[PDB]
């Protein structure tokens, strides 16, 4: 699964690279 990792929100800004 991956519903038990949200607070990766360094990498995730935008979602194309």
């Given at each position: ?9 360094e ?7």
């Amino acid at each position: 699964g991956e519903e038990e990792l949200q607070e990766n929100q360094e990498l995730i800004r935008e979602k194309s690279n």
